Amino acid sequence: AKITFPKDFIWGSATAAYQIEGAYNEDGKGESIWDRFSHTPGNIADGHTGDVACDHYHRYEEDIKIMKEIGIKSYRFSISWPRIFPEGTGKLNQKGLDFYKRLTNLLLENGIMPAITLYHWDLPQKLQDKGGWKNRDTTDYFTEYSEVIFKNLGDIVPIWFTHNEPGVVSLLGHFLGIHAPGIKDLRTSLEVSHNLLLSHGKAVKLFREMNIDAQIGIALNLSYHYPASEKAEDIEAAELSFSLAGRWYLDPVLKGRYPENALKLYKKKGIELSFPEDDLKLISQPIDFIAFNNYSSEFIKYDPSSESGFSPANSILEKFEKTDMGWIIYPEGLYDLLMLLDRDYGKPNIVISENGAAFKDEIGSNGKIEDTKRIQYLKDYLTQAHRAIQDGVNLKAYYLWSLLDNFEWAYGYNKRFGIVHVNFDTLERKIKDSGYWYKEVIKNNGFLE
């Protein structure tokens, strides 16, 4: 069958500033928590850093030409907070604004709609020295940064995301310690979760008060958490697992409450956190769309003697095909997630702000990257997105992660998600088969399956 998306469907591709830009100490930029984390041996696979990355800071013109060749109609990127306020607050670094004004204007000149993430993990290190996201004041410094950006770009950028994956920043950055800033403390991670969400609400309020003529949302990490069987104890386990993961952020944002099942667990663990009563009313400011980053799905069993009360169903997981990340490939998961969003949250407008896959790429004798498994993944996942649309979900846009191979956080350069290959030694770009496939998808507004 022929899969044709809605006429006005937005086809995009996404990146993040630390992952692509390089120029880590150029034009007055301040140190970020990811600069510090990357420089510390043992934190990144193979001792890789984002010092140079794709060097997009210098090579953006070439990248925009590639975007035009593929025909992406929107580009999702993030702004580096420490390029704008090197110390987090205080003296504005005009050269920072200048880089992003140029970039934005060039995107628009080439007929590519900019879509901007304000926070994609690069907190200024000076703020982390003061306590980082554990410090409520950081939520005000974030709002002050957001104000400058809205003043300079607001009414030429149609789509805005406040945060990218606060639940990852909290969990990996502040409980597991495997992301910047490398903290390991449950209570701190929960205070950080809250302040991230608080800062989202402050920014959205500000955006409305400044009458910016654009749309604003947030990009959450979301997966469907399947129970291991149809037994109520498994169903309840999976529901709890989701409530401690993506729904710990969805419910505050869209319903103005934390999930009750998760609050009971944390109380059972001896954490009963109390924040001003008005914080949830601020967190749940109306947004124009809910966005999410999705790659895979979870399978959860009842596990009553565990600290959590649930665990991964490994016998189910071990049977799926996996990506180079070790993540299960299960395209129907994206359908089930989209239908949950639509059912549980009053049929919101939805954006997939990231979806993609890492596979091992090889340049052939013919000089080409024939990344068939990445194409198959994208086609299977987009087929399910389309099935959701036909079933009434208000899915408006799909941003393919990523335009470029990039610095994959703690994995360094070992994990390639691009539709465009980057040689990290030479900085040469080469469009993969997946990039030319996406070119075709955009031109045909879909594909056969």
From Swiss-Prot:
Keyword Protein biosynthesis: no
Active site: 165, 354
Enzyme class, UniProt record, top EC level: hydrolase
Keywords, alphabetical: Carbohydrate metabolism, Cellulose degradation, Glycosidase, Hydrolase, Polysaccharide degradation
Catalysed reactions, semicolon-separated: Hydrolysis of terminal, non-reducing beta-D-glucosyl residues with release of beta-D-glucose
Keyword Hydrolase: yes
One of the GO biological process terms: cellulose catabolic process
Top-level lineage group: Bacteria
InterPro entries, alphabetized: Glyco_hydro_1 (IPR001360), Glyco_hydro_1_AS (IPR018120), Glyco_hydro_1_beta-glucosidase (IPR017736), Glyco_hydro_1_N_CS (IPR033132), Glycoside_hydrolase_SF (IPR017853)
GO cellular component, one term: cytosol
GO MF annotation list: beta-glucosidase activity
PROSITE patterns in the cross-refs: GLYCOSYL_HYDROL_F1_1, GLYCOSYL_HYDROL_F1_2
Pathway it works in: Glycan metabolism; cellulose degradation
EC number(s) reported in the record: 3.2.1.21
Family listed: Belongs to the glycosyl hydrolase 1 family.
PANTHER family in the cross-refs: GLYCOSYL HYDROLASE, LP05116P
Name of the protein described by the UniProt record: Beta-glucosidase A
Organism listed in the record: Acetivibrio thermocellus (strain ATCC 27405 / DSM 1237 / JCM 9322 / NBRC 103400 / NCIMB 10682 / NRRL B-4536 / VPI 7372)
